[PDB]
C-alpha cells in the first residue's frame, strides 16, 4: 500500500589514521538505488538498482557535487561536535543522518524526516510538524538555536513536501515491475527436540519483498508472544528477504497449535500447523 | 534524489 524514500548518511572520524569517511546510501522502500562512498577509488554517485540507470548524465553529475560538498560539510560537523560535546581530538566519532519521507497509497506525503545521531545516540530530529526541533541534550540545543535563527526547518519542509514526494513517485514508476510487485513468503515449519521433555517449532519465511512481516506463534489462543524467539528480518542478497520465529513447545499432546504469517504480498494471512 | 545539507551544526 504505502511507499517510503530514505537517504542514510554516515560520517566516521578516524584520527591517527586519516581523513573522515562519508557514505551516503539511498533506498526506495527496501531497495538500494544510489551509493556515494568518499572512500572509493574514484568517489561518484553510483547506480545500485537496475531501474535508476535510465536517469540522464545530469542526475549523476548533480548528485556527485551534492555528495562531494556534503563530505566537507560533515567534516566540519565532526569538528564542531568536539567543541559542543566538550570532546578531545584524539577520539574516533560517528555522525548519522536519516533523510526522506513516507507516502500513502494516494501518493500524498504521510510523514517527513530529518534526523541526526552522534556516537550511536540521538542528536537533532525534525518534529512531525516540519517546523520544530527535538534536541537530545543542551549541546544539541546549540544546533537547534543555530538552525531556528537561520530558518533551517523551512528548507527541509520544502524538500520533504515537494522534491522528495515527486522523486519517490518517479522512482516507483521507473521500477514499476519490481518496487510495486507483490512477493509473498515461502512458508514451512521445522521441528527439532531441544531435550526429551521439550521441542522447538521454528517457523520459516523465505524470498519476500517488502521487508515488513509479522510471524506470531499462538498456543490455541493469540497471546503467546512473550515466550517466542524471533530473528531480525535478514536480506537474501537478491532483493528478497528472510525471517524465522521459534517457540519452545513441550513434548506430549502439545504439537497441535498453529503459526500465523502476515505479508502485504499475501491475499490472506497464512496459518501453518506441523505434523511428521 | 538527495539535496545538499541545509546548514552545519
Amino acid at each position, epitope marked *: 500500500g504505502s511507499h517510503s524514500m530514505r537517504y542514510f548518511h554516515t560520517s566516521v572520524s578516524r584520527p591517527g589514521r586519516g581523513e573522515p569517511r562519508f557514505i551516503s546510501v539511498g533506498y526506495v522502500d527496501d531497495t538500494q538505488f544510489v551509493r556515494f562512498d568518499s572512500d572509493a577509488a574514484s568517489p561518484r554517485t553510483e547506480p545500485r538498482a537496475p531501474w535508476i540507470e535510465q536517469e540522464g548524465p545530469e542526475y549523476w553529475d*548533480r*548528485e556527485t*557535487q*551534492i555528495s*562531494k*560538498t556534503n563530505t*566537507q*560539510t560533515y*567534516r*566540519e560537523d565532526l569538528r564542531t561536535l568536539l567543541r559542543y560535546y566538550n570532546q578531545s581530538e584524539a577520539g574516533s566519532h560517528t555522525i548519522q543522518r536519516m533523510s526522506g519521507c513516507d507516502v500513502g497509497p494516494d501518493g500524498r506525503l504521510l510523514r517527513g524526516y530529518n534526523q541526526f545521531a552522534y556516537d550511536g545516540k540521538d542528536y537533532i530530529a525534525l518534529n512531525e510538524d516540519l517546523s520544530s526541533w527535538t534536541a537530545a541534550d543542551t549541546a544539541a540545543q546549540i544546533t537547534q538555536r543555530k538552525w531556528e535563527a*537561520a*530558518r*533551517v526547518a*523551512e*528548507q527541509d519542509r*520544502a*524538500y520533504l513536501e*515537494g*522534491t522528495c514526494v515527486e522523486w519517490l513517485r518517479r522512482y516507483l514508476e521507473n521500477g514499476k515491475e519490481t518496487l510495486q510487485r507483490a512477493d509473498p513468503p515461502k512458508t514451512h515449519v521445522t521441528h527439532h527436540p531441544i531435550s526429551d521433555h521439550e521441542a522447538t517449532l521454528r517457523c520459516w519465511a523465505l524470498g519476500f519483498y517488502p521487508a515488513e512481516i509479522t510471524l506470531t506463534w499462538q498456543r490455541d489462543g493469540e497471546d503467546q508472544t512473550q515466550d517466542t524467539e524471533l530473528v531480525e528480518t535478514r536480506p537474501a542478497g537478491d532483493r528478497t528477504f528472510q525471517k524465522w520465529a521459534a517457540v519452545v513447545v513441550p513434548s506430549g499432546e502439545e504439537q497441535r497449535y498453529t503459526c500465523h504469517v502476515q505479508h502485504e504480498g499475501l491475499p490472506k494471512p497464512l496459518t501453518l500447523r506441523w505434523e511428521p | *534524489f*538527495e*539535496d*545538499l545539507r*541545509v*546548514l*552545519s551544526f
Partner: T-cell receptor
Framework: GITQSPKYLFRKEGQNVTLSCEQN?????MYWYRQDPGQGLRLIYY?????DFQKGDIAEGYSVSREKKESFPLTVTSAQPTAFYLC????????????FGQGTRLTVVE | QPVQSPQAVILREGEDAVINCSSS?????VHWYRQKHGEAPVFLMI?????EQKGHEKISASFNEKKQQSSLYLTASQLSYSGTYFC????????????FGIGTKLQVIP
C-alpha cells in the same frame, strides 16, 4: 561583518593579484562577483563550505581557495581587463540573507 | 538567468514606482538589494513563501503564487531611493547560489 580588501587596486600587464575577503559571522557560504555596466552582477566563484568551492560562470583568469571558514580569497591572473569586484557571504546559502563587502576597483595600468 | 522587467526607470519625487522580476526555474527565495554605484548593495528584504509579505509601506515586496515572479513596490519615493535594485534568486538541490541579473537603474528626479 565582512572585510573585502583593498578598496582601490591597480594592475600591470600580465600581472596576477589576490583580492581579500574575510568574515567572523561564522557564515558557511561565500561569493565573488564582477560588476560591469550593462552586464550587472555576475558570479565568478562561490563556496558553501571549507575545502569545497565551485566555478561558473566567469572564468578562466580567476582562482580561489577555501582553507578556512573565515577567508575566501580571489586571485585574478594574467587574463581579464578592468572591473568592480564585490564580495558576499551568507550563513547557509540558499535561504539566509547575503551580506556584502565594501568592493574593489581594479584597473589595468599599462 | 534572473530577468528584471524595468531594467532602468526615471521618476518624479513622491511618485510610486513598481519593479518586477521573474524566473523560469522555481526558486526557494528572492532577495532585494539596492546599490549606490561604487558601494556595497544594501539589503532590503527576503521572501521564502508563497504570497504577499510584508506590507511594510515605503518599501514592500510581493512573491507570486508558485513561484519565480517577485515584484518590489516603492510608494512615496524619496531622493535616497536612487540606485541599482538587484534581485537575488536562490534554487533547490543543487543550484544553491545567489543569482543576479541586470539590475534596474532607478533615478528619482527632484
Amino acid at each position: 561583518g565582512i572585510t573585502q580588501s583593498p578598496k582601490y587596486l591597480f594592475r600591470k600587464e600580465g600581472q596576477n593579484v589576490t583580492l581579500s575577503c574575510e568574515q567572523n559571522l561564522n557564515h558557511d557560504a561565500m561569493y565573488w562577483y564582477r560588476q560591469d555596466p550593462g552586464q550587472g552582477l555576475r558570479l565568478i566563484y562561490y563556496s558553501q563550505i571549507v575545502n569545497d568551492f565551485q566555478k561558473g560562470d566567469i572564468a578562466e583568469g580567476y582562482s580561489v581557495s577555501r582553507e578556512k571558514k573565515e577567508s575566501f580569497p580571489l586571485t585574478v591572473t594574467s587574463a581579464q581587463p578592468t572591473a568592480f569586484y564585490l564580495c558576499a557571504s551568507s550563513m547557509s546559502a540558499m535561504g539566509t540573507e547575503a551580506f556584502f563587502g565594501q568592493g574593489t576597483r581594479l584597473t589595468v595600468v599599462e | 538567468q534572473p530577468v528584471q522587467s524595468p531594467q532602468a526607470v526615471i521618476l518624479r519625487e513622491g511618485e510610486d514606482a513598481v519593479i518586477n522580476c521573474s524566473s523560469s526555474k522555481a526558486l526557494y527565495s528572492v532577495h532585494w538589494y539596492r546599490q549606490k554605484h561604487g558601494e556595497a548593495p544594501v539589503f532590503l528584504m527576503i521572501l521564502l513563501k508563497g504570497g504577499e509579505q510584508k506590507g511594510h509601506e515605503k518599501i514592500s515586496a510581493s512573491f507570486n503564487e508558485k513561484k519565480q515572479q517577485s515584484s518590489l513596490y516603492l510608494t512615496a519615493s524619496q531622493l535616497s531611493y536612487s540606485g541599482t535594485y538587484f534581485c537575488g534568486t536562490e534554487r533547490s538541490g543543487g543550484y544553491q547560489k545567489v543569482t543576479f541579473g541586470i539590475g534596474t537603474k532607478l533615478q528619482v528626479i527632484p
